[PDB]
Amino acid sequence: MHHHHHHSSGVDLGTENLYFQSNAEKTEQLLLASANQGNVDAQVLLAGFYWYLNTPEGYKKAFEWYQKAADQNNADGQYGLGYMYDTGTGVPQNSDTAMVWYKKAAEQGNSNAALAIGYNYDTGTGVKKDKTQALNWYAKAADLGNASAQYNLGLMYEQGDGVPKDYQKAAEYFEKAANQGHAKSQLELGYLYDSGKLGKSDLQKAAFWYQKSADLGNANAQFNLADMYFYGDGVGKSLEQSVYWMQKAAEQGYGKAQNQLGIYYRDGIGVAADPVKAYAWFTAAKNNGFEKAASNASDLEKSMNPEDLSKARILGQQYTDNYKA
C-alpha cells in the first residue's frame, strides 16, 4: 500500500564484476602460508599486513609476528617490537622494553631504530632528556641514510638546540634529506637560501627547493613558491603561476593562503576580479583562524549587493568545508 517505494535503486543495485572483489583475503593466506613455515621475510611482511588493518585485533597479530621475526634475530622484527612497546600499540606501553629492542635493531644497522632512540633522548620520553645522546643517535641514523634523522639534525644546527647554531651545517643535513624527497627538508633548505643566512641570498635555489616541496604537496612551500612568482624572486614574475600555487595551498585549508587568494580575487591579481570568490576565500580564511581575513570580508560587504553577498556566504561555507589540512 506504500511498500512499492521499497524497490532497490542504482548504487545499491547492479550486476557485480571484478571491481567488487578484494585481494585482501588472498594476500593474507599467501603470507600466512609462508609465515607459518618459519620464513622470516614472510613473517615481517605479514606483520606489516596486519599492521595496516588499523584494528585492535590487527595490532595484536602484528605484534605476534614481529615477535616471531625478532626471535630469529631479524632487525625489522626487532624494530617493530620496539615501536609497539614504545607506543603501547598491540601491547602495554613500556619504554624500557622498547629501548632494548630498538638497540638490538640499530646495532644491526636499522636506521629507524637509531632514529627512534635519538628522538626519545631528544624529547626525554621514557628516558632523561639528553641532547648529546640525541645528537649521536640521530647522527648514526643519518649516516645510515635516514632522511628523517638528517632533517632533525638540520633543525638542531639551524636552531642551535644542543649544538652551536651553524646554518651551513644545517643546510648540508637538509640537502641530504631533500635529495631523498623529504618535502619538509626541501622547504627548510629553500628558506635558508631565501633568507641570506648562508652568506648571500640565493633566490634561484630558494625557488628551486620550494618548487620541489610544493610538488610533494607541502602547503607552506606552495604558498612560498606562489609568492616567489608574485615578486619574480628566482623565477620570472608570473601572476598566473602565483594564482596556480596559491590556489593549491588554499585548497589545503591554509588560512594564510586563503586570505592571500582572497586578495588576488578582490584586486584582480592573475585572475579577473571576482568579489564573490574573494569574499568566500576570506570567509574560509577567517573560519580557519586567520583573523585579518575577517575585516577583509567586512570591507567587501559594503560594495556587494544582497544576492552576491548571499552567494558569497554560501560559497565561503563550501570552501570552509571542502578544504582541509
Q: Do the Cβ atoms of 149 and 180 come closer than 8 Å?
A: no
Whole-angstrom Cα distance, residue 105 to residue 115? 11
Task: List the grid coordinates of 68.
Answer: 616471531
Query: CB of residue 307 vs Ni ion: minimum separation in angstroms?
Result: 38
Closest to Ni ion by CB, 1 or 11: 1
Q: Do the Cβ atoms of 320 and 289 come closer than 8 Å?
A: no
Q: CB nearest Ni ion: which residue?
A: 3
Query: CB of residue 7 vs Ni ion: minimum separation in angstroms?
Result: 11
Query: CB of residue 8 vs Ni ion: minimum separation in angstroms?
Result: 15
Query: CB of residue 1 vs Ni ion: minimum separation in angstroms?
Result: 4
22: Cβ contacts below 8 Å, ≥ 6 apart: none
Closest to Ni ion by CB, 5 or 200: 5
Q: Would you state the torsion angle of the CA atoms of residues 22, 28, 33, 37, taken in this order, to the nearest 10 degrees?
A: 170
> ∠ at Cα 237 (233, 242), nearest 5°?
95
Question: What count of other Cβ atoms lies within 10 Å of the Cβ of residue 75?
Answer: 20
The stretches of 196-303 forming alpha helices (DSSP H) are: 203-215, 219-231, 239-250, 255-267, 275-287, 292-301
Phi, psi of 90 (to 5 degrees): 70, 15
202: left (phi over 0), alpha (psi -120 to 50) or beta: beta
Query: CB of residue 92 vs Ni ion: minimum separation in angstroms?
Result: 56
Query: CB of residue 6 vs Ni ion: minimum separation in angstroms?
Result: 8
Closest to Ni ion by CB, 1 or 325: 1
Closest to Ni ion by CB, 2 or 324: 2
Closest to Ni ion by CB, 2 or 7: 2
Whole-angstrom Cα distance, residue 142 to residue 131? 16
Which of positions 24-63 make contact with Ni ion (CB under 5 A)? none
Closest to Ni ion by CB, 1 or 18: 1
Residues in contact with Ni ion, counted by CB under 5 A, come to a total of 3
Query: CB of residue 9 vs Ni ion: minimum separation in angstroms?
Result: 14
Which of positions 72-101 make contact with Ni ion (CB under 5 A)? none
Distances (CA, A) of 48 to 60, 80, 89, 140, 301: 12, 9, 13, 25, 54
Question: What count of other Cβ atoms lies within 10 Å of the Cβ of residue 307?
Answer: 9
Closest to Ni ion by CB, 4 or 324: 4
Which of positions 113-132 make contact with Ni ion (CB under 5 A)? none
Query: CB of residue 3 vs Ni ion: minimum separation in angstroms?
Result: 3
Closest to Ni ion by CB, 1 or 13: 1
1-30 mask for Ni ion (x: CB under 5 A)? Answer: xxx---------------------------
Query: CB of residue 13 vs Ni ion: minimum separation in angstroms?
Result: 19
Task: List the grid coordinates of 104.
Answer: 638490538
Which of positions 168-207 make contact with Ni ion (CB under 5 A)? none
At residue 291, what is the residue type? E
Closest to Ni ion by CB, 2 or 302: 2
Point out which residues bind Ni ion (CB under 5 A): 1-3
